[PDB]
Design a protein around this ligand. Sequence first.
Ligand SMILES: *Cc1c(COP(=O)(O)O)cnc(C)c1O
Ligand SMILES: *Cc1c(COP(=O)(O)O)cnc(C)c1O
Ligand SMILES: [Cl-]
Ligand SMILES: [Cl-]
Ligand SMILES: [Cl-]
Lengths: 270, 270
Amino acid sequence: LDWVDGRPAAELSVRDRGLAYGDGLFETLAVRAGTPRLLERHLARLEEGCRRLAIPLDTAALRQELLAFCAALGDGVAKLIVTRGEGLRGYAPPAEASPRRILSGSPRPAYPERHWQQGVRLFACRTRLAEQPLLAGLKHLNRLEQVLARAEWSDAGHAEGLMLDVHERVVEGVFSNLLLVLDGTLVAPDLRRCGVAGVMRAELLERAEGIGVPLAIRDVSMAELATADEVFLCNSQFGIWPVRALDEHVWPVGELTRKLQDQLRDDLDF
Amino acid sequence: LDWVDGRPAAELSVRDRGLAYGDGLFETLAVRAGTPRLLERHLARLEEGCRRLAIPLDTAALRQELLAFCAALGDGVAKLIVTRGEGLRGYAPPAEASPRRILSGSPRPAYPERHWQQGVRLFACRTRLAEQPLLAGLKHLNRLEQVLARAEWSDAGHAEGLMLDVHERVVEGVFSNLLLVLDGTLVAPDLRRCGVAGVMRAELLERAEGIGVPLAIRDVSMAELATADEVFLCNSQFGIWPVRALDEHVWPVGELTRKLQDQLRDDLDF
Ligand SMILES: *Cc1c(COP(=O)(O)O)cnc(C)c1O
Ligand SMILES: *Cc1c(COP(=O)(O)O)cnc(C)c1O
Ligand SMILES: [Cl-]
Ligand SMILES: [Cl-]
Ligand SMILES: [Cl-]
């Protein structure tokens, strides 16, 4: 399945701004029984990106179109890309821009359950996240940093990689967020300089507060990570992977990590 | 005129990685008398981008295809985008990717001669350039910082905007490079952390060195900019615009500036 602007289409104009400048946003939605999981959260992040990038998307008409696409897809993944649309001259956002809405469907990808069960080893990526507060948190199309980090390893012994910012602060994975427990306190790295504010990160923070777990969003150092009670990665496709190792560091699978897995599995079928 | 992979075509797959992640490079070439101006500088930049991003482009063949496209165009602008090509999974560059080669032709941009003759006033952009040494200097497709900066003004009284880095260093324009002259030295801001290494900037550094002007590449502060003897912007399309003002700062059109304009006029059809 591929749609452009709500009609079957597998191609778009070579003059699109999504292609020219990565001038756009994306969401990757798990689909079950014709409907997207965690729909509200995916929509909330897309809408906030459209606000901050001033892309005149009608997010209300989009929810309809997306719902119809997911019903046609039935089961798997729906990737939505919104671009600012056709480019006139150069960088200037055009005045009367019409955003392109591209929907592409795929099968559930093959995330191994053993990563959820036994946990994973992170690759210590050397590619750093640049600090850019105007784009921080948004799931925009400028993803060359993730492409470069992903390319640093190709083996099966590492399921994800650790991305630090240019001050070596601990930020996130290559395609997932990282959270850690420091004193029975659940700590999420602050994403106001770089990173992607994950839908699962937002979901788990709210669920942990629901159960009385003390939270903090703040800067986290490498030294703090090495001494953490437990560590895990999350995203809206695999849910939670406990982190067991990073270079010489090891961590056991933690109690809070297991409690949240059990909540995600029973409540939402992760 | 629009070609994809050397064949007339106005569309590309919605699954392309240039659209998904801005996983690619571009060159905007001025076409004069049936040929791309500064062709070897554009291809050197594109080649070095392909090396640093590991995009397996046959640059020798691309040269032939570009030459044929520019002869068909005759005069105007040929924009080349090269993308890593079709996207199988997520961020990982695919194993056996075939890059896409997109060529689009346009009329010359319409620039007032007054900008060349008398110079321009710069807008003082608030958008900063983040520091990412892996991407620095390359004319890659992750250009949302240029989109946001260009969005800061829409009036005809500012021809360009000055972009600083996140530590307030003077780096470049939104779509052109900045150079200064101090006590007879042509000084270029250092582009090792961010910015695009312009083909006109490279041309002018080599021209100035060729006539015995000493060069320096280094970090430039706002205070140093303010006390420069001459300031100008440069790019492959407009050539050179003397910088006459930035907020309250004022500069005359300088002697080395006008010498280099005369070279561009006499030697490169400007
Ligand atoms: C999507 C993404 C995340 C987190 O995603 P969710 O699926 O929204 O929880 C984290 N990092 C990067 C780089 C991403 O692209
Ligand atoms: C292209 C570009 C330049 C300079 O370009 P040339 O045309 O190569 O001389 C400077 N800055 C940005 C952001 C650019 O895109
Ligand atoms: Cl081919
Ligand atoms: Cl003025
Ligand atoms: Cl610092």
